[PDB]
Amino acid sequence: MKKLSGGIRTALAQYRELAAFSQFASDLDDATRKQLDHGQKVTELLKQKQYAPMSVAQQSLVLFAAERGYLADVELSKIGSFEAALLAYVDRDHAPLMQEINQTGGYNDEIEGKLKGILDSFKATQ
Amino acid sequence: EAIAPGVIERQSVDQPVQTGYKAVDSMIPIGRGQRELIIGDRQTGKTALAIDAIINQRDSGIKAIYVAIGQKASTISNVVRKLEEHGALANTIVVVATASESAALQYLAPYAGAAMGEYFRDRGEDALIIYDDLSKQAVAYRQISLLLRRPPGREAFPGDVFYLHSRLLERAARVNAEYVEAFTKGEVKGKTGSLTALPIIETQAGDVSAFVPTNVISITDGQIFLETNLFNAGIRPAVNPGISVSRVGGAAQTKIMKKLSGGIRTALAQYRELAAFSQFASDLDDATRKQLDHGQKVTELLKQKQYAPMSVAQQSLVLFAAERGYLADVELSKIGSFEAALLAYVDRDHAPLMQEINQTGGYNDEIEGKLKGILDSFKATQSW
Amino acid sequence: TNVISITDGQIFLETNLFNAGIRPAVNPGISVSRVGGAAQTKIMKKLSGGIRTALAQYRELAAFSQAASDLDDATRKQLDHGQKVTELLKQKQYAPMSVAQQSLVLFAAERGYLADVELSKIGSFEAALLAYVDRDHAPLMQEINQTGGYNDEIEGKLKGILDSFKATQ
Amino acid sequence: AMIGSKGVSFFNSVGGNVVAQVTGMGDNPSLSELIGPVKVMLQAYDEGRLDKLYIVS
Amino acid sequence: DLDLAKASATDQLKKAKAEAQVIIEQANKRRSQILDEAKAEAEQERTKIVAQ
Amino acid sequence: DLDLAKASATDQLKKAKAEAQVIIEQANAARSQILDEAKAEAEQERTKIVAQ
Amino acid sequence: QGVVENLASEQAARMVAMKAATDNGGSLIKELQLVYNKARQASITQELTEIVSGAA
Amino acid sequence: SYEELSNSQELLETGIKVIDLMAPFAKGGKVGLFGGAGVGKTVNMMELIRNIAIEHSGYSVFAGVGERTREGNDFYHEMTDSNVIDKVSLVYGQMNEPPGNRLRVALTGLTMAEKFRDEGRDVLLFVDNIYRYTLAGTEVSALLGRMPSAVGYQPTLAEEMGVLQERITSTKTGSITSVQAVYVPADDLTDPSPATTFAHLDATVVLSRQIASLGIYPAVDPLDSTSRQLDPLVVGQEHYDTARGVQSILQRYQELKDIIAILGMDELSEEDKLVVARARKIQRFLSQPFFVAEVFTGSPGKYVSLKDTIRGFKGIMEGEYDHLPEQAFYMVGSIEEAVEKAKKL
Amino acid sequence: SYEELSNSQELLETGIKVIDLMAPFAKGGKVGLFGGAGVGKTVNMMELIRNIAIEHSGYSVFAGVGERTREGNDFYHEMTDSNVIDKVSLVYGQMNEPPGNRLRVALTGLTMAEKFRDEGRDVLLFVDNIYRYTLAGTEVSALLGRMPSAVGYQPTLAEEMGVLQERITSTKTGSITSVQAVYVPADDLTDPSPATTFAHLDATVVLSRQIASLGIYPAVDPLDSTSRQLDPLVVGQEHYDTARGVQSILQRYQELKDIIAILGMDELSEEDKLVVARARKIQRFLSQPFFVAEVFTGSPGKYVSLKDTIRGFKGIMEGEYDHLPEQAFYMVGSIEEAVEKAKKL
Ligand SMILES: Nc1ncnc2c1ncn2[C@@H]1O[C@H](COP(=O)(O)OP(=O)(O)OP(=O)(O)O)[C@@H](O)[C@H]1O
Ligand SMILES: Nc1ncnc2c1ncn2[C@@H]1O[C@H](COP(=O)(O)OP(=O)(O)OP(=O)(O)O)[C@@H](O)[C@H]1O
Ligand SMILES: Nc1ncnc2c1ncn2[C@@H]1O[C@H](COP(=O)(O)OP(=O)(O)O)[C@@H](O)[C@H]1O
Ligand SMILES: [Mg+2]
Ligand SMILES: [Mg+2]
Ligand SMILES: [Mg+2]
């Protein structure tokens, strides 16, 4: 979580200023456009239903998805359904990895590669 | 000191007391037995409105009481001289407590006037009582309480200041015929008495959050807001249609005046909102243009000179001219001359209809037809 | 406000001018002496004239000029004159000057001798003028410092001194 | 001849004779819209109605 | 066209000639109304002041 | 000539409309003078009566 | 060509006007904050004087 | 005691668009109508009475704490003429009465309601104005030797408020449903008296003078009103989604209006312009004429079901009615007749 | 007593354009100069003395209450030099005095004025600073064992002010014309001491620090200055219409200034720009060089008739002088002097 959360922190910090440009963002540098459509999607991802706590594995998984650019082509209106589908998929096909993450919370290349495989395999569905 | 009539002894307010002002009589009707607060900053015309309301009663049969708390005696001399220049003084009682007199006299002054008005109310006659600057009464009572070493509350006022004004103002009420018969021991039967109170409160900078203004606003049955900006803009009387309200409403109006003004008041409020919105937009939809022009002309229409009350028939005629669209083509500046010329023309040529409207106050299809014919004839033949 | 209602005037020092390097930071328009010219020496009263009101007007004219300007000839003269007199008024700390040296710099200011000298040279012009008048016009400085009088003879003397200094700068 | 609504409004308030108007180009204005007013001004000029033409910008 | 022109000329002449006369006559009526009102109210005021 | 019907109407209508205004103004002045003089005579009657 | 150049001049003028407007807003904010702070201190002082006086 | 309480949040329909949509009532819950002087608390409570208490088919208690005598007389005559007075008991302490009467009058109504509840009946309790009770307490406090606190309220403000409010509850034997008008001094919701009572209620309806200044009654503020029942488990997903959509749209419009006021509407994105338009439509659609206010308006009152309110707000949130003017919705009623006013406009 | 009071409407002319235009006052009335510290109450009072003494041959009383001793010495010496001293009685208790002298000094001046009045003369009374009397009352109030009120003023503030003010009145036996300067603490026009004084005065002239900082003198605020005499019956229709036109134009300028501050003047409509241009000219024209201020400005003072000021302001509002620059109107006595200044800009 410490490794992943810095991306969220900086993404929201950048998104806050561009919110002023959101009214007329049609005429902007494409870099600024990317930053804006990334901050908006992160803010949309952070919302959560009451009484539904997420384990560290699931928060880390969705944060990895948001930070590594896998949400770049997903529509703002559909972020929540993407999150729910991803959580159901990982709960169905890859429970041991979630168990290890909940038990240790460690991070290394052997884990990042597994998460990359998880997200590539999920992205073929839904 | 006396208690107000209980719940079971009162009767619903459904009779008009005419102020003679187009704005007040139209948007904010006052009924026989209502408590209507006049509130505003210094030098905004609060006293003028109340004395004009007193002047207008010279022929309506309603007795008048003017209570002066803490004002300088020369102002009261001028007020009495103005009431005497018209026929109003013979119908009016004046109770005076000048600024020099001791605080006890000033704080007791409203109650003496309340008892004097209650004399008429219990015999079945109508009385209108003006409390001028109840804030000065509250100041005198604060002085009295502080000299008695009673614990000061908020804003250094004593805690029971609300009970003072509440028990003062609750005397103004309309009593059913049974209470009148019981009081008179059968000498008077079948008549209901009423006392109408118009307290005056001065706000320092429009700040309604002060202790005395909050209490008086809580007690009364409505308020008429006069504010400096409209007065300086030339809108006199400077009645703010948005924050001013009458809680009795249409039941106090005659049928025709109610029909005409009901839409008018909220139309003017929403016009002010739209004019706030539209101020920088170059393109206006034709509906929005209609609303803006109509609102400007109605705002211009309600201005009225001091000491010039208008009868019910004249107010009804002018409001009919405004509502039914006849004012639309007239340029804004000529609206006043249009009104004056219409009043003079109708007075000379169509007196019987004015008499009928003033006496009955009724409204019918033939009444509307006659008014429409009068408007068409005036607009064709005459010149502003 | 309690203190202002007692004294015979106030000298208002403005933090914005002090930060801008205008020191002493005396803000006209707010600052005033209520005894007025009666305290002043004749020569200083004559030469000071309307300086405070001219500066008060100029400080508002410069604030408006940043947005837009009209009558760009007279307003230009007013702006440059105001800027140069503000540059002339700045004086270093622990550096008092007698009424004589004060009188002649005001003469150079109001008679138009400073009109065509650039801002970056106003202080050097003032120092050179003081050193120059200290050399050979010492009797006139002594006369001015003894009696703060004004007359056409010393008027012409000051005019000639300014002309000669302006020639040999 | 008038391009843009601001000139239309100002010169209608002044009451000067306006023969042609075009509005609503926004960004990326096109010559295709411009062909009109210049065509009518040319027609006025060559038929003697106009003797000199100026562009104001 | 000749018939329409003559008819319109006569119609507008008649209409203007009537309307201007009406306007001036009713202006005289208004003047007389104001004069009568002032004449009555002067004595009304004096009769109030003497009782005062 | 037909196009002068409006012209011939404006030669009469607006001039009479304007003249009505000064006709009313003179009556207004007369009214004001009458009421002022009535007040000024009533005051001098009242003062005489009270002084008696 | 004249139309295009006028459009460019319009854009430059708008940029300048928006800079001026931003500076004006920034200048207004600080005066509003000073007034608000004066009111904030005054309210605390008045209410504490009232509380102390009420403890007769 | 703690063991006797119940949580039977049976939904209750009021027939008012904004109240049913944004702040749904529950049987046995407590409802507060917050507002300044002259915003519509009394007429709203009268409309609520006419709707529920007549159909309720049960006993009701009306506590006139610090009410105007004229209004109490009018209410009594209204109940008599409509011939429902036989089911309702009235307790009145008017303004002119000394502070003791206003201080204690509410407890008499609470005692009668508790007597009815302990029998096992379901009763409606109406309080004219809770605020006046605390005002009577503040009046008496200074002479009682207590030192002042806060804005000059008595130190025991929260204790008294809790003591009165905690007796108005629905126990396992019987349920008390209560609607309380709460005066807000100078419309400042920060004031301790309105601030404290907020925690005791279940549904809170806030009337704002800023809306009332425009004449658009009921003047209920959708962005401040809330109810405990407004969650998917009770209202179902449809109602929750509609309410959240309306809230978000109005919130966005509140921000956009600031740009519009100075810079003008042309500076907005076309989507922001569309949002402003549809939000300005929804704002007017929340208005509804009450047939207890015909004396004021002069127009017939309207009653609306929950389903029709949901469908209408859904239709306005979507493109179905983008073409209708803003005035076409003002004080109309159901969406099915806004088109008629648009044709008439 | 109430019977003895006498009414009078004889307008008293002054040389000051703004005063007699916006707030004219009648012989035997009360005039109050409200202002903060340094806005120029004393200068205006001295100019009023100079102008009014021209057409008034009766006696005069000047009562200095808690002001500078230096100003008293200067006034006395300038009275002696002009050989008019023998018509003026001077009662001086200045700020250096202990509180009792400042508290009771005004009553002595009032007693002398009443003695002159009861003889049947027409007297002029000038109070250098009425505020100090209430300030001395505040200083001594705490030691007398009286609980503080409001902002710490004495509880008897209103009675103490009223008992003093009520004695300064014209009577059927004789008339008193009164001019009073009223200090405004911390420029708060809502302070109880200024607030109470407003009701006792017939004409009130409010001086604003913001205008004085522009260098416009006298710094009279025309949107707050008001007089009982501004009535079409007394002043006549033309003066009334000119005054109300000026008031409305300045109100519109105040309304536009908030937009001007942010967006600048360019955004305004072409009629709004004309309104601003005329309002600025009106504001400049209200300035006037005073004879007593020659020691400050240097320029000679001017005396302006009522006819000239009303004609000039009516001409400015009609737009006859729209071709002149703003500076043309600054510190000019009359409109002809304004056009003469325009030729040299
Ligand atoms: N309708 C009106 N049209 C024009 N002038 C008016 C009107 N009503 C009042 N005025 C004028 O407004 C001024 C103040 O009027 P008034 O004395 O009634 O005010 P007020 O609010 O009672 O004042 P104060 O605070 O001094 O008691 C007077 O000059 C009066 O003639
Ligand atoms: N007509 C005028 N022309 C120029 N300056 C003026 C004019 N009127 C007043 N002033 C300025 O007003 C300043 C203060 O005036 P004055 O002494 O009358 O103030 P005050 O309001 O009586 O103040 P205080 O509260 O200190 O007694 C003077 O320094 C002077 O410059
Ligand atoms: N729904 C409404 N329809 C029409 N008028 C209303 C409505 N609500 C409030 N008003 C106006 O507000 C006034 C006061 O309403 P009321 O509820 O008595 O005030 P309060 O809320 O202070 O009790 C009424 O006279 C009425 O004219
Ligand atoms: Mg008054
Ligand atoms: Mg209500
Ligand atoms: Mg002074």
Side-chain angles (χ1 to χ4, degrees), chain I residues 205-242:
Chain I
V205 180
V206 171
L207 311 185
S208 173
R209 182 182 304 278
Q210 293 77 17
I211 302 180
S213 58
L214 303 185
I216 289 182
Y217 296 98
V220 175
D221 187 5
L223 294 181
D224 210 326
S225 296
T226 309
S227 174
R228 191 63 52 175
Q229 297 289 311
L230 196 56
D231 177 29
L233 302 185
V234 33
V235 300
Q237 190 64 30
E238 191 176 15
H239 188 175
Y240 185 74
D241 287 333
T242 301

Side-chain angles (χ1 to χ4, degrees), chain I residues 318-333:
Chain I
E318 290 178 16
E320 298 186 22
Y321 305 84
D322 271 316
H323 44 91
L324 305 183
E326 305 177 352
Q327 285 291 278
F329 307 92
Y330 183 68
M331 292 299 181
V332 296

Side-chain angles (χ1 to χ4, degrees), chain B residues 108-343:
Chain B
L108 289 174
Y111 294 110
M116 294 176 188
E118 271 180 314
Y119 173 89
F120 299 99
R121 181 205 61 185
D122 307 325
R123 282 148 183 77
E125 312 184 31
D126 296 310
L128 172 67
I129 177 167
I130 308 299
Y131 302 113
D132 208 331
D133 273 15
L134 287 186
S135 60
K136 297 181 172 302
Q137 184 213 24
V139 166
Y141 186 69
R142 172 176 71 187
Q143 165 186 349
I144 287 182
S145 292
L146 291 186
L147 291 180
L148 288 177
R149 311 287 301 190
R150 289 180 180 179
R154 180 192 177 187
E155 208 168 347
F157 281 101
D160 61 353
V161 66
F162 173 81
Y163 175 61
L164 188 82
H165 287 160
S166 70
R167 84 173 191 260
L168 164 65
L169 285 179
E170 280 296 297
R171 299 194 193 181
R174 180 187 184 187
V175 289
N176 52 46
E178 218 67 25
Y179 168 84
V180 182
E181 295 176 4
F183 182 86
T184 52
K185 301 181 177 303
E187 291 178 354
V188 180
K189 295 178 171 297
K191 298 206 308 178
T192 65
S194 164
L195 177 63
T196 302
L198 267 65
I200 296 184
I201 287 300
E202 163 169 331
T203 52
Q204 296 301 141
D207 185 13
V208 303
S209 64
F211 195 12
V212 184
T214 42
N215 299 332
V216 181
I217 291 177
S218 307
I219 302 166
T220 51
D221 301 314
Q223 64 277 1
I224 303 181
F225 262 96
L226 312 182
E227 60 179 9
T228 308
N229 305 123
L230 307 180
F231 188 88
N232 290 334
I235 308 181
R236 305 173 186 176
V239 177
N240 188 284
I243 45 194
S244 302
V245 63
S246 174
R247 291 183 179 90
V248 176
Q253 269 164 333
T254 55
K255 200 173 65 177
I256 168 164
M257 288 286 302
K258 160 178 187 281
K259 174 79 64 178
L260 299 180
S261 55
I264 278 293
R265 94 157 283 254
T266 53
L268 194 53
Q270 292 197 357
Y271 146 78
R272 289 194 303 111
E273 161 57 27
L274 178 67
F277 188 83
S278 310
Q279 58 174 8
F280 294 145
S282 304
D283 52 330
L284 285 312
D285 198 0
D286 285 337
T288 64
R289 184 76 61 179
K290 289 181 183 179
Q291 293 210 223
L292 175 139
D293 176 78
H294 192 236
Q296 281 191 354
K297 274 152 184 172
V298 168
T299 296
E300 174 63 28
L301 191 77
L302 299 185
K303 296 159 60 171
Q304 177 175 352
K305 291 187 296 184
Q306 196 178 4
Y307 307 123
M310 292 189 177
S311 175
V312 182
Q314 297 159 335
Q315 302 188 41
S316 310
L317 172 75
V318 181
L319 291 178
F320 177 86
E323 269 281 345
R324 300 308 137 92
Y326 292 100
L327 287 183
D329 53 329
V330 190
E331 47 265 61
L332 189 62
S333 62
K334 294 180 185 177
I335 289 295
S337 58
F338 181 94
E339 167 176 344
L342 171 62
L343 291 189

Side-chain angles (χ1 to χ4, degrees), chain I residues 265-307:
Chain I
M265 195 175 306
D266 295 325
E267 265 300 320
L268 297 180
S269 172
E270 290 312 309
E271 57 176 9
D272 299 332
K273 298 177 177 176
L274 187 66
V275 167
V276 167
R278 287 170 171 173
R280 294 179 66 86
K281 295 188 182 71
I282 291 184
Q283 284 185 349
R284 267 65 197 172
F285 192 50
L286 287 167
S287 309
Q288 173 176 345
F290 281 166
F291 296 100
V292 306
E294 295 171 345
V295 306
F296 306 111
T297 69
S299 50
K302 301 295 178 175
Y303 186 100
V304 194
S305 173
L306 175 60
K307 183 178 185 300

Side-chain angles (χ1 to χ4, degrees), chain H residues 187-204:
Chain H
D187 272 310
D188 199 4
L189 289 175
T190 317
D191 188 293
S193 180
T196 304
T197 178
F198 260 118
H200 296 275
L201 307 172
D202 293 329
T204 64

Side-chain angles (χ1 to χ4, degrees), chain H residues 130-208:
Chain H
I130 275 299
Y131 172 79
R132 221 129 300 272
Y133 161 74
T134 69
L135 187 58
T138 299
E139 293 193 51
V140 297
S141 170
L143 298 176
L144 291 180
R146 309 201 191 99
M147 303 209 305
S149 64
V151 211
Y153 289 99
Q154 64 276 24
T156 62
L157 173 62
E159 168 74 2
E160 300 161 5
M161 177 68 69
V163 159
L164 187 142
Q165 293 286 354
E166 286 295 77
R167 294 169 52 179
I168 310 180
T169 43
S170 295
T171 68
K172 296 175 179 173
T173 67
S175 67
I176 302 184
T177 301
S178 58
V179 177
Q180 309 171 348
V182 176
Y183 182 75
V184 185
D187 272 310
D188 199 4
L189 289 175
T190 317
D191 188 293
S193 180
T196 304
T197 178
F198 260 118
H200 296 275
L201 307 172
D202 293 329
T204 64
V205 176
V206 178
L207 319 182
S208 61

Side-chain angles (χ1 to χ4, degrees), chain A residues 1 9 17 19 27 31-33 36 53 60-61 65 73 78 82-83 91-92 95-96 100-101 108 111 126:
Chain A
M1 292 292 299
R9 180 95 289 271
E17 72 106 348
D27 195 334
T32 67
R33 220 179 313 272
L36 194 47
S60 57
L61 172 77
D73 57 353
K78 307 179 60 56
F82 178 92
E83 167 191 356
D91 175 67
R92 180 171 64 256
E100 309 311 313
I101 296 303
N108 50 32
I111 287 178
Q126 188 269 347

